[PDB]
């Protein structure tokens, strides 16, 4: 039997990323770059997309690992920009079925730094469609817009 | 077993009282010297103690402590009235700069009454009293009554401290900020507070 | 002594034990005890199988 | 034949000496009324990589 | 030695407070719920650490009490740290009737399952129907609309008693329910064959009951 695999990860309107798509590897994928480049942010987006349970999600620093802190802020809100945001995964099923899972993220206006999540799923999408293009509208001269 | 410092904390004579208060929803500010110091000292363990109830112990950035229930709260929940929030937002506005020179931290019921009346829309006012009411004396009287009532509620919350005499004059604590607006880089507090009030 | 009796009189459990006389109540209680012991014996025998 | 008289007469004549029991009635946890959720909409745009 | 649980707290008390059952129970108890023999988990827990709990709650100026029938409950003192409240007279009428129903061997064959209609029928059989109707409405004179209103008030109060733990509805049918021994507190004014006035005085002195 052929085991399923994760094909790619897509980020839209995150802190520092407007619309970026990482193509995963069959065995190992590495992220490199100086401090503050955005590696841990990519990890967080993936996990978020995986388990949208807002109760659970808590992104501590790598230092202070293992300390149950109850911090005032879970650390997700700041990784998002104003407006609408997305995080999606493309998966090839053992059945050789292409399925697109993801979440719609959006900041909540108000003093409390809260976040809203709406999961979604897509089945049967043609192999020629890329999520980056599916989630954006081409407005103006190569100045695309994101769509709700 | 149980962590030693947690056992120490809840063995303290101040705990029962503070527990009682907290469960009620009271906010602990810098004014309550002993309670605030106690929370500062034993926060790391009290947070864990109250997490067992599916209730969150939060320290606001301004400095005051309070409890926030989850959906799964073990403590029976209760919710504020629209009028309540109205009033609260009002008090947040009154925590102004000219306040210092205007009243030296001590207000009166009439200040809030008149501010409420002046700043709010008629329609929502009506909604607060009864939709069939129309600009009548009796209506105003009832509104006054409700104001007093809600004010008392708030005092229970610890938002507002009445000066110790029968007359209705009070001072506003920092914890009123919980009503306040979101602050963005360079934004003027007066404007944003009014924007939400509108 | 009277006080003692008064004290005790309230502490009766249910109707079949409503002998207003404490001392009289004692035996009834004990009867219950024996009853309960037999029921427990039968139940633990059932549990084994 | 002990409680029939004892309890029936109490119900029959309650209003001559109405009495009420006491219970613990701890306060409910006051919470903010949830306002209608207001998200941030900004129609963001940008150059595509 | 220092940094040792015994310095601040008895081991058994800390062991109790660390149990997974405690928060539930605490929450409930504070809310006024009575604990009987049927909810094993809770009851057993209570039994195991009785004295520690009593000592604990004492800090609050409240007595953790054990009735002879085997049910636990909270009784606040005058100086209580936790508020205290009183039941309504309609609640008492339904309470004393539920008590007589529990005792009745004539209905023991039901295996504890009773219907709201049977309760209502027993109540009207004993109390003064037309005079009791006064609490529903000052003009009540036996009209069916008023009789249905009385039945609905009963349904409501019964629902409140359920929350106090005095009665349990069936898992799938709400028109039927089962009694528990906690109802015997409504008989506190007559369990001893003595002068009613003196009994009442004793009860108010103990903080069990208030007049109206
Ligand atoms: N919640 C947040 N609010 C504001 N800024 C944040 C937040 N989380 C991360 N940042 C900033 O985003 C940038 C990316 O941080 P991130 O941890 O993803 O980088 P990195 O390349 O993984 O770094 P490092 O390897 O040092 O952990 C950094 O400037 C960080 O300060
Ligand atoms: Mg990082």
Q: How far apart are CA A47 and CA E125, in angstroms?
A: 67
Say what the alpha-carbon torsion angle E149, E153, E159, E164 is, to the nearest 10 degrees: 180
The atom number, within ligand 1, closest to the CA of A62 reads: 27
Indicate the CATH number for domain B1-69.
1.10.10.2250
Size of the A and B interface in Cβ pairs below 8 Å: 18
Classify residue A21 by burial, with Cβ atoms within 10 Å: 0-12, 13-18, 19+. middle
Q: Say whether A144 counts as a known binding-site residue.
A: no
Q: How was this structure determined?
A: cryo-EM
Query: Class of the B82-180 domain?
Result: mainly alpha
Alpha-carbon distance values, B112 to A58, B131, B168, B170 (Å)? 41, 23, 11, 10
| Among candidate residues A62, A75, A55, A71, the one with its CA nearest the CA of residue A15 | A75
Task: Measure CB to CB from residue A111 to each of B51, B58, B181 and give the nearest one.
Answer: B181
D29 alpha-carbon distance from chain centroid:
10
Please give the backbone phi and psi of residue A67, each rounded to the nearest 5 degrees, phi first.
-90, 115
Neighbours of B113 (CB within 10 A): 17
Are D43 and A145 within 8 A, CB to CB? yes
Q: Is A83 annotated as a binding residue?
A: no
- Residues D34, B82: contact at Cβ < 8 Å? no
Instruction: Confirm or deny that A118 is annotated as ligand binding.
Output: no
Distance (Å) from CA A79 to ligand 1 centroid: 8
Question: Is A36 close to ligand 1, i.e. is its CB under 6 Å away?
Answer: yes
Tell me the chain D residues in contact with residue C20 when contact means C-beta distances shorter than 8 Å: 2
E runs forming strands in B100-193: 107-108, 160-162, 169-172
User: D26: which chain B residues are within 8 Å (Cβ-Cβ)?
Assistant: 23
Q: How far is the CA of A36 from the centre of ligand 2 (A)?
A: 6
- Whether A104 contacts A115, CB under 8 Å: no
The answer, yes or no, to whether any atom of ligand 1 lies below 6 A from the CB of A39, is yes
The structure tokens listed for E47 are 């039994």
Q: Is D33–B80 a contact, with Cβ atoms under 8 angstroms apart?
A: yes
Q: Is A128 annotated as a binding residue?
A: no
Going by DSSP bridges, is the β-strand pair E72-76/E62-66 parallel, antiparallel, or unpaired?
Answer: antiparallel
CA-only gyration radius of chain D, Å: 32
Contact status, residue E33 vs residue E164, Cβ threshold 8 Å = yes
Domain locations along chain B: 1-69, 82-180
**CA distance, residue C11 to nearest chain E CA (Å):** 6
Contact D3 C20 (CB under 8 A): no
Token pair in block for residue E132: 């009791």
Put simply, the answer to whether B7 touches E9 (Cβ < 8 Å) is yes
Q: Is D5 on the interface with E (CB under 8 A)?
A: no
Whether chain C lies against chain A with 3 or more Cβ pairs closer than 8 A is no
Rounded Cα gap, residues E50 and E16, in angstroms: 10
Query: Residues in chain E whose beta carbon is closer than 8 A to a beta carbon of chain B?
Result: 3-5, 8-9, 14-15, 17-18, 23-24, 27, 31, 59-60, 81-82
Gap sites in chain B (C to N > 2.5 Å), preceding residue numbers: none
- The answer to whether domain E89-187 has CATH 1.10.10.2260 is yes
- Rounded Cα distance between E70 and E40, Å, is 12
Radius of gyration in angstroms for the set of CA atoms belonging to chain E, rounded to a whole number: 20
- Which one of 3.30.470.30, 3.30.420.40, 1.10.10.2250, 3.60.110.10 gives the CATH number of domain E5-76? 1.10.10.2250
The Cβ of residue E187 has, within 10 Å, a number of other Cβ atoms equal to 18
Taking the C-alpha atoms of residue B75 and residue B69, their distance in angstroms, rounded to an integer, is 8
Q: Does D4 touch chain C (CB under 8 A)?
A: no
């Amino acid at each position: 039997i052929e085991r399923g695999k994760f094909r790619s990860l897509t980020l839209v309107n995150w802190n520092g990323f407007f619309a970026r798509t990482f193509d995963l590897d069959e065995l190992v994928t590495t992220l490199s770059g100086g401090n503050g480049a955005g590696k841990s942010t990519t990890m967080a987006a993936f996990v978020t997309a995986l388990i949208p349970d807002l109760t659970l999600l808590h992104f501590r620093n790598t230092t202070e690992a293992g300390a149950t802190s109850g911090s005032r802020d879970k650390g997700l809100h700041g990784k998002l920009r104003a407006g609408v945001c997305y995080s999606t995964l493309d998966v090839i099923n053992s059945r050789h079925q292409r399925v697109v899972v993801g979440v719609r993220l959006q900041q909540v206006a108000g003093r409390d730094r809260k976040v809203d999540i709406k999961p979604f799923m897509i089945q049967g999408l043609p192999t020629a469609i890329q999520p980056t293009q599916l989630l954006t509208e081409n407005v103006g001269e190569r100045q695309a817009r994101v769509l709700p | 077993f149980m962590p030693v410092k947690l056992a120490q904390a809840l063995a303290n004579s101040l705990f029962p009282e503070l527990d009682s208060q907290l469960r009620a929803g009271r906010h602990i500010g810098i004014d309550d010297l002993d309670n605030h110091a106690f929370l500062m000292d034993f926060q790391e363990q009290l947070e864990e103690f109250y997490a067992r109830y599916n209730v969150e112990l939060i320290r606001a950035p301004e400095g005051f402590f309070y409890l926030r229930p989850r959906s799964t709260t073990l403590i029976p929940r209760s919710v504020l009235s629209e009028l309540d929030m109205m009033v609260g937002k009002i008090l947040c506005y009154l925590y102004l700069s000219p306040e210092r020179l205007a009243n030296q931290g001590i207000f009166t019921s009439q200040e809030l009454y008149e501010e409420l009346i002046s700043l709010a829309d008629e329609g929502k006012l009506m909604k607060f009293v009864n939709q069939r009411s129309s600009g009548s004396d009796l209506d105003k009287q009832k509104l006054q009554e409700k104001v007093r009532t809600t004010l008392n509620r708030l005092r229970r919350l610890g938002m507002v401290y009445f000066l110790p005499n029968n007359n209705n004059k009070f001072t506003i604590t920092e914890a009123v900020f919980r009503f306040g607006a979101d602050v963005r880089s360079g934004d003027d507090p007066r404007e944003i507070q009014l924007r939400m009030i509108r | 002594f009277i006080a003692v009796y008064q004290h005790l009189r309230e502490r009766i459990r249910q109707d079949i034990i409503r002998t207003d006389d404490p001392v009289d109540a004692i035996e009834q209680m004990e009867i219950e005890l024996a009853r309960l012991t037999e029921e427990l014996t039968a139940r633990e025998q059932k549990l084994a199988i | 034949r002990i409680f029939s008289q004892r309890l029936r007469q109490s119900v029959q004549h309650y209003f001559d000496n109405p009495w009420t029991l006491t219970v613990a009635n701890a306060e409910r946890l006051l919470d903010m009324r949830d306002e209608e959720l207001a998200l941030r909409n900004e129609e963001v745009t940008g150059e595509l990589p």
